[PDB]
Coordinates of C-alpha atoms and ligand atoms in Angstrom, one line a residue:
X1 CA 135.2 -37.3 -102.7
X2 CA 131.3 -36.5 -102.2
X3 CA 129.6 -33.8 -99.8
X4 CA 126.1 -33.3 -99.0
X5 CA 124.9 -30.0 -98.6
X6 CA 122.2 -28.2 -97.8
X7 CA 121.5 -24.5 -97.5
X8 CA 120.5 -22.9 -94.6
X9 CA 121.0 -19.5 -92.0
X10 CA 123.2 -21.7 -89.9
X11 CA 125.2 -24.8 -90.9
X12 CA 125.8 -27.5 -89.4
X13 CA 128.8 -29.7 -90.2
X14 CA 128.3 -33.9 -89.8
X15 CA 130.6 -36.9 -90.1
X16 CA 129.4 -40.5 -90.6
X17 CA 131.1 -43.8 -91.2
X18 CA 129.3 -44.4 -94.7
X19 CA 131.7 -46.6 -95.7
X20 CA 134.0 -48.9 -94.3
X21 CA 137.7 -48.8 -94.2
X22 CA 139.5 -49.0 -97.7
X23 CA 142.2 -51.3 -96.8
X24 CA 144.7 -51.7 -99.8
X25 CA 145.2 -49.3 -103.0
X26 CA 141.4 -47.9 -102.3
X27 CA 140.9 -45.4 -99.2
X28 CA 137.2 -46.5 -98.7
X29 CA 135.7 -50.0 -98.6
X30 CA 131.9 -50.9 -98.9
X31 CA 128.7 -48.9 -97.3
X32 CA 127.7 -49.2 -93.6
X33 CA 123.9 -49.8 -94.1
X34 CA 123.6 -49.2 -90.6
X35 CA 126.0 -47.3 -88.8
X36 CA 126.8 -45.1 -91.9
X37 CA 123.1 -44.5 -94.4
X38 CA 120.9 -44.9 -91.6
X39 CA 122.4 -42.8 -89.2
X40 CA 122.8 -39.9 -92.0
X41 CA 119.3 -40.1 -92.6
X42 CA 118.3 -40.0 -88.5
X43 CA 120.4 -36.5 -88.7
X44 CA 118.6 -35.5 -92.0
X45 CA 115.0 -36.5 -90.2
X46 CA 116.0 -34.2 -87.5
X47 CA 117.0 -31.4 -89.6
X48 CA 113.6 -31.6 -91.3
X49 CA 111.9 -32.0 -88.1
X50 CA 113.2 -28.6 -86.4
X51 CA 113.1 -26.6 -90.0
X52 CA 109.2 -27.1 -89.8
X53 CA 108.9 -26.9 -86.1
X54 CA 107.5 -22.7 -85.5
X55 CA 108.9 -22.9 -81.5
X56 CA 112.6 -24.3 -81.9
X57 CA 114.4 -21.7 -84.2
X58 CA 111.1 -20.4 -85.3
X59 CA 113.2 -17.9 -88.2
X60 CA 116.6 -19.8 -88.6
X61 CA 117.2 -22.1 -91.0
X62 CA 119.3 -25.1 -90.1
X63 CA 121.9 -26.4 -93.1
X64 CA 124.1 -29.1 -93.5
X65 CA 127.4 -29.8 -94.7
X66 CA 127.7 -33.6 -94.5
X67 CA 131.0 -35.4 -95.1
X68 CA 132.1 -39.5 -94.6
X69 CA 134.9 -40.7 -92.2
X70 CA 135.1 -44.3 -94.5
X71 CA 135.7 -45.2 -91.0
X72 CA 139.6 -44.0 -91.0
X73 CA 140.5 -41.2 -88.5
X74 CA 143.2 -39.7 -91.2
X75 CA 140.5 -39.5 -93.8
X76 CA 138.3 -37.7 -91.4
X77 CA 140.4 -35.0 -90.7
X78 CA 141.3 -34.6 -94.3
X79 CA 137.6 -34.4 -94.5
X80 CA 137.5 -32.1 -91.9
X81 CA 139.5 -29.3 -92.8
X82 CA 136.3 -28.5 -95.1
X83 CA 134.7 -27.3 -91.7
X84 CA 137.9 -25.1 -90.6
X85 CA 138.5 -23.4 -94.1
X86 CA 134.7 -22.4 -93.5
X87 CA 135.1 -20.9 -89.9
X88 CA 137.8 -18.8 -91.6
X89 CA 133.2 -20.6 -97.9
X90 CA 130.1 -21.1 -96.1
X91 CA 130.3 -21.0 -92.3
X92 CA 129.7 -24.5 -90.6
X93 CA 128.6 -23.3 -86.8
X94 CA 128.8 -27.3 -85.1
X95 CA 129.4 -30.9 -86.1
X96 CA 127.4 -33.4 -85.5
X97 CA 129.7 -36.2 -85.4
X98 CA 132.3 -39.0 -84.5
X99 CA 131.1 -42.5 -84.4
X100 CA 134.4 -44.2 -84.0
X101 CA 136.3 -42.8 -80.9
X102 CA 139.3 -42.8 -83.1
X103 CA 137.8 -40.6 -85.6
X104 CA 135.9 -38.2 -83.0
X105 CA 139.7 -38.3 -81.3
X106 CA 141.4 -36.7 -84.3
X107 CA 138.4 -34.6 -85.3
X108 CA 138.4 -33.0 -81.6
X109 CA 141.9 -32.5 -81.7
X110 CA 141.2 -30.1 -85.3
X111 CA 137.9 -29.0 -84.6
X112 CA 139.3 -27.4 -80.9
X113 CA 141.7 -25.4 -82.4
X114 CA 139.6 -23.2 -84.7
X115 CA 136.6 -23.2 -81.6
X116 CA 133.9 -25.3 -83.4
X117 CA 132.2 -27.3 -81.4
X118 CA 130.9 -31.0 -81.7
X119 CA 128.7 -33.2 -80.7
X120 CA 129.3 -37.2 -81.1
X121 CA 126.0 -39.6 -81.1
X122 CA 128.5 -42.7 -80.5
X123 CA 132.0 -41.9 -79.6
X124 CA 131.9 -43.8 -76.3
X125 CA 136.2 -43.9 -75.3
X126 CA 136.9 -42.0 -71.9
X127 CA 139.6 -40.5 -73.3
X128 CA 137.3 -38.0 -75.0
X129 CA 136.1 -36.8 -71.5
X130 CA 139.8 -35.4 -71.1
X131 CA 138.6 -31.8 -71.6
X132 CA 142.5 -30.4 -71.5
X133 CA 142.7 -32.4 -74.9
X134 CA 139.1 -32.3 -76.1
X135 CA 138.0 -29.2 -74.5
X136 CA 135.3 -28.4 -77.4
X137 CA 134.0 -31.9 -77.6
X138 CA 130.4 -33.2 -76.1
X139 CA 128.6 -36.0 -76.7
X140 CA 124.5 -37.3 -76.4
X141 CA 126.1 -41.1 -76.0
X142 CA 127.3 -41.7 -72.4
X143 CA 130.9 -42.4 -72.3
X144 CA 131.4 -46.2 -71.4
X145 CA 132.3 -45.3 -67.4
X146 CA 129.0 -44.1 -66.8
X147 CA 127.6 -46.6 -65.7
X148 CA 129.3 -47.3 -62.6
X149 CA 126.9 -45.4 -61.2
X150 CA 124.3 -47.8 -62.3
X151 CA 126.4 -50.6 -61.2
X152 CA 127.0 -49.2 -57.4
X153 CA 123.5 -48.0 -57.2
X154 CA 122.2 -52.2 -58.1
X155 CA 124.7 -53.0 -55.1
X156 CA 123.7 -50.6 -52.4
X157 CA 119.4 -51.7 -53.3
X158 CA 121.0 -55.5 -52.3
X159 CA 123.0 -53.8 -49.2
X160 CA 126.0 -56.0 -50.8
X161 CA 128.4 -53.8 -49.2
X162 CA 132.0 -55.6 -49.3
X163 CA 132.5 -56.9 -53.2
X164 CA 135.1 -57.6 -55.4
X165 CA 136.0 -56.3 -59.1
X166 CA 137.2 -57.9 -62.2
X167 CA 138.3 -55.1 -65.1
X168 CA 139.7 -55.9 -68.4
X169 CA 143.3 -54.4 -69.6
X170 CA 142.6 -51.6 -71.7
X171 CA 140.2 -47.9 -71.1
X172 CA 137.0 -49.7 -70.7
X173 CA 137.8 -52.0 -68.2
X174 CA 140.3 -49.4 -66.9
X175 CA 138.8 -46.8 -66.2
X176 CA 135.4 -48.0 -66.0
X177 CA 136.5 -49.9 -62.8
X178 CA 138.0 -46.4 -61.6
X179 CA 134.6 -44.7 -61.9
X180 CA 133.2 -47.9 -60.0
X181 CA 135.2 -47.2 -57.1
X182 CA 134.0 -43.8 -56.8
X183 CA 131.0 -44.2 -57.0
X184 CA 130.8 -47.0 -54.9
X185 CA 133.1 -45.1 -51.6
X186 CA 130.2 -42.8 -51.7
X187 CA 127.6 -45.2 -51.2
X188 CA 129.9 -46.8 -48.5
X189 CA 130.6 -49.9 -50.6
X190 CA 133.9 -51.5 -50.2
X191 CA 136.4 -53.8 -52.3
X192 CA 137.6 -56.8 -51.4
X193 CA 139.9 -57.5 -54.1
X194 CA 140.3 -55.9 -57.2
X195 CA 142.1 -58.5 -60.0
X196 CA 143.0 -57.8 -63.9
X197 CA 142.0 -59.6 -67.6
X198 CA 143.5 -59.4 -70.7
X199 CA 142.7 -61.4 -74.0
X200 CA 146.8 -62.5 -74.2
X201 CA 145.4 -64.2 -70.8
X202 CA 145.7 -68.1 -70.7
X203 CA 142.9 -70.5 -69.4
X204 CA 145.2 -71.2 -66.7
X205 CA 145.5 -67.7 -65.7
X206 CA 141.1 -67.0 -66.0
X207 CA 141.4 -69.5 -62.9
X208 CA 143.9 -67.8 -61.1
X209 CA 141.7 -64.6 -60.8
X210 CA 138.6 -67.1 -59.4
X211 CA 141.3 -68.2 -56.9
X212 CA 141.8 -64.6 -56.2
X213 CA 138.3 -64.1 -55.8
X214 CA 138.1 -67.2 -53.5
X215 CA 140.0 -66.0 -50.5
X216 CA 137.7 -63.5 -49.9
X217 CA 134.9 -65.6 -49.1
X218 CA 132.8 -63.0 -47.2
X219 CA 132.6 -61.0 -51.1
X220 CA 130.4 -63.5 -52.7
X221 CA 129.5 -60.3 -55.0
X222 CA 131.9 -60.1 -58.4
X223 CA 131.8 -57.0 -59.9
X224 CA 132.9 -57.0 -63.9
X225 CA 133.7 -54.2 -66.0
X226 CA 135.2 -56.3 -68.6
X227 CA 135.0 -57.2 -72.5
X228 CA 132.8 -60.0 -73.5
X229 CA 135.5 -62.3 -74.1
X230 CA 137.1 -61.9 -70.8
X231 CA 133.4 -62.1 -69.4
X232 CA 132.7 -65.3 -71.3
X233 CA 136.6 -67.1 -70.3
X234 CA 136.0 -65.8 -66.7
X235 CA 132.6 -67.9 -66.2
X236 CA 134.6 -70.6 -68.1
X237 CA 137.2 -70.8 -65.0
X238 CA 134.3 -70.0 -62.6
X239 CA 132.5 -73.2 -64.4
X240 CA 135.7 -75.6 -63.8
X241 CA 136.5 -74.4 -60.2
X242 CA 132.5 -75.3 -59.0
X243 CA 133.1 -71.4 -57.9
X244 CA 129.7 -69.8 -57.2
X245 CA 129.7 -65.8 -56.9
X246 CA 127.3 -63.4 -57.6
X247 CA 127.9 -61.4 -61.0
X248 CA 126.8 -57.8 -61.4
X249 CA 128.1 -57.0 -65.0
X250 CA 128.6 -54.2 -67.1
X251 CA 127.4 -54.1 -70.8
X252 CA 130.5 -56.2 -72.5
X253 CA 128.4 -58.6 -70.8
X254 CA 125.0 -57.1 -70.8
X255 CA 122.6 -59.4 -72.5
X256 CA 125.0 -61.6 -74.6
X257 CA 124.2 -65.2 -75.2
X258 CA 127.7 -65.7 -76.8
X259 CA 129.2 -64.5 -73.3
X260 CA 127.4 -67.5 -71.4
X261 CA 128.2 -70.3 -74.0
X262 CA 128.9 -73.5 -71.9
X263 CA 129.0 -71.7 -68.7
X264 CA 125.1 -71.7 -67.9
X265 CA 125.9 -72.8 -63.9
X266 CA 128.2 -70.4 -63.3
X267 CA 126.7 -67.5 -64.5
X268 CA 123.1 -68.4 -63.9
X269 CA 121.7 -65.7 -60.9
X270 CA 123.8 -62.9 -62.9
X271 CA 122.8 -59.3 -62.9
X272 CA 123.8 -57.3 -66.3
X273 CA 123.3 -54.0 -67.7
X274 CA 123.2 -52.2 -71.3
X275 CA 122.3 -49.0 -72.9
X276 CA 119.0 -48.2 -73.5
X277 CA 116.8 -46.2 -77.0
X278 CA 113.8 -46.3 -77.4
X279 CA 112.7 -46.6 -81.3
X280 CA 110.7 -43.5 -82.9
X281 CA 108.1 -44.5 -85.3
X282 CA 108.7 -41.3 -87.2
X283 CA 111.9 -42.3 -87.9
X284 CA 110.8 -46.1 -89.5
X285 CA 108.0 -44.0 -91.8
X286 CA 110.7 -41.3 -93.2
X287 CA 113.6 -44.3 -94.0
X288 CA 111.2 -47.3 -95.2
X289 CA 110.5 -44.6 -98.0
X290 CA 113.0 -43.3 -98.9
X291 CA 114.4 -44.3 -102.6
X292 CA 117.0 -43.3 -105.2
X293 CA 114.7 -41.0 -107.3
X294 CA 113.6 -39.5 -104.5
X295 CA 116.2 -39.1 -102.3
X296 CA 118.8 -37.4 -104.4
X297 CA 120.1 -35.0 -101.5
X298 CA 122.2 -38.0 -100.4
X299 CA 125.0 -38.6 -103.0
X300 CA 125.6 -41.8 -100.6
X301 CA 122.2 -43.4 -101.6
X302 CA 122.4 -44.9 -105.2
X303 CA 125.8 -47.1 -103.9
X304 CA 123.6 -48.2 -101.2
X305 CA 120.3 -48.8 -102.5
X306 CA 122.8 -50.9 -105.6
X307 CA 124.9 -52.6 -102.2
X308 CA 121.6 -53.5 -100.1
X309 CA 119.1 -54.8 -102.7
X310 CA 122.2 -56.5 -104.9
X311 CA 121.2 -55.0 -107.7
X312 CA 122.6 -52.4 -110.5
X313 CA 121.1 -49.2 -112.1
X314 CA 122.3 -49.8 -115.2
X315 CA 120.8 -53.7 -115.5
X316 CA 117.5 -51.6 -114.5
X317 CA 116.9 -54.5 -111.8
X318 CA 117.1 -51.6 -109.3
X319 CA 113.5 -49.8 -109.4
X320 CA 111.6 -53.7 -107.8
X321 CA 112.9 -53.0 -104.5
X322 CA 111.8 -51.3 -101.5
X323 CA 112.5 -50.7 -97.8
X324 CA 109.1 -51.1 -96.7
X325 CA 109.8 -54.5 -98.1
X326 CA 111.6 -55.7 -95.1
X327 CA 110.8 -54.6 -91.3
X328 CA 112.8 -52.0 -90.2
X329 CA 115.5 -52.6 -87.8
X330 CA 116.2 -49.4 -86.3
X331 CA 120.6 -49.2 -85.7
X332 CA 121.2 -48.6 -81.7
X333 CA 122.3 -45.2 -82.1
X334 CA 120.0 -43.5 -83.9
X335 CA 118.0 -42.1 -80.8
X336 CA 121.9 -40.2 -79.9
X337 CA 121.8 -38.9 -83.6
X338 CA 118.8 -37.3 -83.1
X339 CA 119.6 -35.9 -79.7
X340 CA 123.1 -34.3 -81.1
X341 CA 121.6 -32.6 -84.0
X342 CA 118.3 -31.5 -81.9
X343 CA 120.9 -30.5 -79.0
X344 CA 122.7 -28.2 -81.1
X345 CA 119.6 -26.7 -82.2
X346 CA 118.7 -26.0 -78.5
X347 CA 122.3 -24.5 -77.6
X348 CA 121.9 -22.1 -81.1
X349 CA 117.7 -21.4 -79.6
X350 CA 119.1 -20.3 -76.5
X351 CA 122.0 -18.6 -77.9
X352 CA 119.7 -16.4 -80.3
X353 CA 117.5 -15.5 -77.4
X354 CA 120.3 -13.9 -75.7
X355 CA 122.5 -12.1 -78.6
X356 CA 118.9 -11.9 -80.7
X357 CA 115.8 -10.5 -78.4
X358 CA 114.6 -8.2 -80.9
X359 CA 113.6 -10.6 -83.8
X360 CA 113.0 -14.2 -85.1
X361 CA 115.9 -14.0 -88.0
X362 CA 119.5 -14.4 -87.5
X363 CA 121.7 -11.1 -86.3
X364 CA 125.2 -9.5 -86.5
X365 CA 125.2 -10.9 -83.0
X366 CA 125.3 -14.3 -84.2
X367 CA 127.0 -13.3 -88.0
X368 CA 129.3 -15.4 -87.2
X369 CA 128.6 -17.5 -84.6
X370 CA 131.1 -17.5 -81.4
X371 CA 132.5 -21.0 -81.0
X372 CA 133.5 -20.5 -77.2
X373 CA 130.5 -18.7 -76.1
X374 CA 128.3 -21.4 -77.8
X375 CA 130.4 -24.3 -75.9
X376 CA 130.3 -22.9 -72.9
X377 CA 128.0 -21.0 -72.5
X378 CA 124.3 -22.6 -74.1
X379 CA 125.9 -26.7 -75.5
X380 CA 126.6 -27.5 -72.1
X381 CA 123.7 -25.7 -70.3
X382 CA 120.8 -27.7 -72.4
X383 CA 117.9 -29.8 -70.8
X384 CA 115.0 -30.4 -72.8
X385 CA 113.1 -33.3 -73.3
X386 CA 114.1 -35.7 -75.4
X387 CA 112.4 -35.6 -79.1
X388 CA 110.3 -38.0 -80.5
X389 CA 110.5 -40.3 -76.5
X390 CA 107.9 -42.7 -75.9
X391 CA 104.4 -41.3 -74.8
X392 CA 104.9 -42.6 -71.0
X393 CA 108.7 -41.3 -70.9
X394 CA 110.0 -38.4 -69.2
X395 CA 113.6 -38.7 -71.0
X396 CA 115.9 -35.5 -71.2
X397 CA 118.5 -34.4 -72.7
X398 CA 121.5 -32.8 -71.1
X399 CA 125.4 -32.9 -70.2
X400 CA 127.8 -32.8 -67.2
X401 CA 130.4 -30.3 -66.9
X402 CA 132.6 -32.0 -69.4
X403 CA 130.4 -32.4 -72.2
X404 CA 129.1 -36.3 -71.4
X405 CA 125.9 -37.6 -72.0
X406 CA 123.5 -38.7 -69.4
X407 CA 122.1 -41.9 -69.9
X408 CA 119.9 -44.6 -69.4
X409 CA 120.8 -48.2 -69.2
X410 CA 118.4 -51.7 -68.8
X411 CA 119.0 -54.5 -66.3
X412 CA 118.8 -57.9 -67.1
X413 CA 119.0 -61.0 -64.9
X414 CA 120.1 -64.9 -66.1
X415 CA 118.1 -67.3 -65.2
X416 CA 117.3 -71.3 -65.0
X417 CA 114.2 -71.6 -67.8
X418 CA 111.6 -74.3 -68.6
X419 CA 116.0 -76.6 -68.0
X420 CA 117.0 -74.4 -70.5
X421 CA 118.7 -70.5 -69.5
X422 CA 117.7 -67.3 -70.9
X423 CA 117.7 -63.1 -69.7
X424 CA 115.0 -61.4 -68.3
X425 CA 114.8 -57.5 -67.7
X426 CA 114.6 -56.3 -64.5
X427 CA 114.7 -53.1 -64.2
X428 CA 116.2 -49.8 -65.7
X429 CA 118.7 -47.3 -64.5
X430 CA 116.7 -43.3 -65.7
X431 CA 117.8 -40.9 -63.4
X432 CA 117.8 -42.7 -60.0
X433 CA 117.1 -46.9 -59.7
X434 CA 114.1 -48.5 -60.1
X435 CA 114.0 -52.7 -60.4
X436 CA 111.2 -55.2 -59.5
X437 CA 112.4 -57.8 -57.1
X438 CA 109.6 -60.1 -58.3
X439 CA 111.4 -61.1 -61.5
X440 CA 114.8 -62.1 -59.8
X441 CA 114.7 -66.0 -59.2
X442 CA 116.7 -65.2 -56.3
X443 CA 114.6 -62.6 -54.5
X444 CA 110.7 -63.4 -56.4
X445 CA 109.8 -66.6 -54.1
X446 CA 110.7 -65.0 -50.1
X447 CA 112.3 -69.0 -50.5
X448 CA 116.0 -68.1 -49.1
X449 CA 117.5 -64.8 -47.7
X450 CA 119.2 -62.4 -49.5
X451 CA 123.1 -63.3 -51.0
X452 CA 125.3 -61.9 -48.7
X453 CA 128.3 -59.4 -49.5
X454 CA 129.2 -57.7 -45.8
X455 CA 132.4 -57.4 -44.6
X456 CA 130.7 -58.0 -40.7
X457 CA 127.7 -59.3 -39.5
X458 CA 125.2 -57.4 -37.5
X459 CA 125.8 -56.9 -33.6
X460 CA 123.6 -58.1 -31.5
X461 CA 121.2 -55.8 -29.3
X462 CA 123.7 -56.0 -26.3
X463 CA 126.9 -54.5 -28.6
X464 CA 128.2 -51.3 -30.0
X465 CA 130.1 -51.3 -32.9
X466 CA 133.8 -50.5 -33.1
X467 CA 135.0 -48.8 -36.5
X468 CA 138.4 -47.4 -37.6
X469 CA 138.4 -43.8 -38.1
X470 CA 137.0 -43.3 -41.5
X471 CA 137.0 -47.1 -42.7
X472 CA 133.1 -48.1 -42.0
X473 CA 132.9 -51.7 -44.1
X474 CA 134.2 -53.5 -41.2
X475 CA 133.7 -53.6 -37.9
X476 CA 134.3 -55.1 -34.7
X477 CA 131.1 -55.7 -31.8
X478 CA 132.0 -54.7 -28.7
X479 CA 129.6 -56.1 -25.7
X480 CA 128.1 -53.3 -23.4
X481 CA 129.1 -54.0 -19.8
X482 CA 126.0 -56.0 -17.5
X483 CA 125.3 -52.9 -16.3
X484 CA 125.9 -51.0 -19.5
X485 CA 123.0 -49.1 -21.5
X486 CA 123.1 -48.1 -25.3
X487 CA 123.5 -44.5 -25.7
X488 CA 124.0 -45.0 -29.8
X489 CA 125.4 -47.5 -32.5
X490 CA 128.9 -46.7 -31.0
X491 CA 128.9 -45.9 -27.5
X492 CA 127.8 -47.6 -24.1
X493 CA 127.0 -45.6 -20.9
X494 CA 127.4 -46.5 -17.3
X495 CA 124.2 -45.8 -15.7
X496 CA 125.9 -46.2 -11.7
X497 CA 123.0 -47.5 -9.1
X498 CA 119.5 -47.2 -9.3
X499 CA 119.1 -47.2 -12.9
X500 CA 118.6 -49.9 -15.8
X501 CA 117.4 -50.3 -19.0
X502 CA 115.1 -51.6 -21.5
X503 CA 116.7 -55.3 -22.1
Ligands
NAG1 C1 119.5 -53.1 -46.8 O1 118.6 -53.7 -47.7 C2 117.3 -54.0 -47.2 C3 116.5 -54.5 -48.4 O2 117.2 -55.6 -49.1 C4 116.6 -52.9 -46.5 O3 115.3 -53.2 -46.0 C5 117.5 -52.4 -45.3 O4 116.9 -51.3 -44.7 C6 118.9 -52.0 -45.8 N1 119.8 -51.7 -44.7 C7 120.2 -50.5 -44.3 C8 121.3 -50.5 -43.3 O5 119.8 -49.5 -44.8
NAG2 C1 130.3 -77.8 -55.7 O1 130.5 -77.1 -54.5 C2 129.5 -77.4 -53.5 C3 129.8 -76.5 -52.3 O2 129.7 -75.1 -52.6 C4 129.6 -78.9 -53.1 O3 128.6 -79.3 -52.1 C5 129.3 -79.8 -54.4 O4 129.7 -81.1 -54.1 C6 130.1 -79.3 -55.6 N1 129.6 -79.8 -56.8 C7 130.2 -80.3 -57.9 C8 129.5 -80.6 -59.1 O5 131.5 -80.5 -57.8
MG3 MG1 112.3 -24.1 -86.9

């Protein structure tokens, strides 16, 4: 029913989950605090931010034509078609939006069609990556899969070489483990075995995959790219079974507590990632003060000032409350709504440059706006650093060739406490890795080598190794001849009479 506009040169469509699905007779439930007000407002901030700013669209004034999913991907494209009918009213040049992958899916599927381009904050499925379905979509949130990349860099740092996986039934653990593979083949990591989980999984059949596991007792590496209650009924079977491996876990894991409930031993020496952001202070200013008398732009904010505080505008119990009340919590996303809207305003920056070199104010060049050229051409080919990172940061923000965030993910280790079992950080995954080995119980003391996961051990000085041509996991090690002299890892050489070597 409601819209929030703003005026502007150039408009920018947006779609939030401000309230939560209807269910019954009504099509829309109650207000996402979080994921729906807040992360409205982190797009409003950032139209603000780059209206004032004289250097990023120095002439052009950026608009907004804001609309609410109520979580439900047919509402959203009923919402939707307000952006289409205005390609050909007012003109809506990108969306900033999609927060469920179900909506962003049905919005993409539209929004291709007329050539508007979109950019989701936190639309994470990897089935929006499939650009001969979603070929106008991006996205400032990595997609799920990404980081494999993460995963198979942690394992070549340990040299742990010969692993095994464990992926969940569905597209995270799916295809998440398929982007593991990859990435690990090029770092010349292999698999051991690779087993499935489901949630229709017994606890009988949770063992069966540790039994799995267990006959290949030279991977003592697991490698998980599963849900957090596969994670949690996997280190349940591990915990019955005495079954000690080494866990390097993706973030259905990452730093849960709720995944390690009762199962302490087994996953105690873990290694876990998540998704990182960084908090901007600018942000927690502009919110904490924001009210319903002054903040009428939003027609979203008197239900959820009403919602939040429990109170009613017409029992005038309403005006006592505040947000500066309470500490601000800033949602996880909000970093990625930020991004989106300030990425879009670097893609229409660069596009104006171009089509625009003879003024500051908007053209016939860009009256209206091409929808392919601005895909293709300038979303795609942004880097700039990140707005409103941390002072020590070197963040940017930029996309691969099919419109997917780069990211930046945290890595935590579980360990044995004070007794008691807790996660520590580790390390962080920007572009390349970077851990200290100081703050793994497992590496910090020298006490113990590091956990093995070759498929061979080391030859001796005396042996070459024997490979098959391409496989390079495994190996065999051949013993040079008495006589026999090293000429490289691979090959011995005769050296006749009168001539021996360095022994
Ligand atoms: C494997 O890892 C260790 C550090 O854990 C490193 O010093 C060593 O050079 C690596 N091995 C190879 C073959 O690069
Ligand atoms: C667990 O397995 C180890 C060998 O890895 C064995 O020495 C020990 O007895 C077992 N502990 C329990 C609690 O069953
Ligand atoms: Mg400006």
């Amino acid at each position: 029913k409601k819209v929030l506009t703003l005026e502007g040169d150039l408009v920018l469509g947006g779609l939030f989950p401000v309230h939560q699905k209807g269910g019954p007779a009504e099509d829309c439930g109650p207000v996402n605090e979080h994921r729906g007000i807040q992360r409205l407002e982190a797009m409003l901030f950032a139209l603000d931010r780059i209206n004032r700013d004289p250097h990023l669209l120095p002439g052009v004034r950026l608009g907004a034509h804001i609309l609410d999913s109520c979580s439900k991907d047919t509402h959203a494209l009923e919402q939707a078609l307000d952006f289409v009918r205005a390609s050909l009213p007012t003109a809506i040049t990108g969306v900033i939006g999609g927060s469920y992958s179900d909506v962003s899916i049905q919005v993409a599927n539209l929004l291709r069609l007329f050539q508007i381009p979109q950019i989701s904050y936190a639309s994470t499925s990897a089935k929006l990556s499939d650009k001969s379905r979603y070929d106008y979509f991006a996205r400032t949130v990595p997609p799920d899969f990404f980081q494999a990349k993460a995963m198979a860099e942690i394992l070549r740092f340990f040299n742990w070489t010969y692993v095994s996986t464990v992926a969940s039934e569905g597209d995270y653990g799916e295809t998440g483990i398929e982007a593991f593979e990859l990435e690990a083949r090029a770092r010349n990591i292999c698999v051991a075995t690779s087993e499935k989980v489901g949630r229709a999984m017994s606890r009988a059949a949770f063992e069966g995959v540790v039994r799995a596991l267990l006959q290949k007792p030279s991977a003592r590496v697991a490698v998980l790219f599963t849900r957090s209650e596969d994670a949690r009924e996997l280190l349940a079977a591990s915990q019955r079974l005495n079954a000690s491996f080494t866990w390097v876990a993706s973030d259905g894991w990452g730093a849960l507590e709720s995944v390690v409930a009762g199962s302490e031993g087994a996953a105690e020496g873990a290694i876990t990632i998540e998704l990182a952001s960084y908090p901007i202070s600018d942000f927690a200013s502009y919110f904490q003060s924001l009210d319903p008398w002054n903040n009428s732009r939003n027609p979203w904010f008197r239900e959820f000032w009403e919602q939040r505080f429990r109170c009613s505008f017409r029992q005038r119990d309403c005006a006592a409350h505040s947000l500066r009340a309470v500490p601000f919590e800033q949602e996880s996303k909000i970093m990625f709504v930020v991004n989106a809207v300030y990425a879009m305003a670097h893609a229409l920056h660069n596009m104006h440059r171009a089509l625009c070199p003879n003024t500051t104010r908007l053209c016939d060049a860009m009256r209206p706006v091409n929808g392919r050229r601005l895909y293709k051409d300038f979303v795609l080919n942004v880097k700039f650093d990140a707005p409103f990172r941390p002072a020590d940061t070197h963040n940017e923000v930029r996309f691969d060739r099919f419109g997917d965030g780069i990211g930046r993910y945290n890595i935590f280790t579980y360990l044995r406490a004070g007794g008691r079992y807790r996660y520590q950080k580790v390390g962080y995954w920007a572009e390349g890795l970077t851990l200290d080995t100081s703050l793994i119980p497992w590496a910090s003391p020298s006490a113990g080598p590091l956990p093995a996961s070759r498929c061979s051990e080391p030859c001796l000085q005396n042996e070459v190794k024997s490979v098959q041509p391409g496989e390079v996991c495994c190996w065999l090690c051949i013993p040079c001849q008495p006589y026999e002299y090293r000429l490289d890892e691979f090959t011995c050489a005769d050296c006749g009479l009168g001539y021996w070597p360095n022994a």
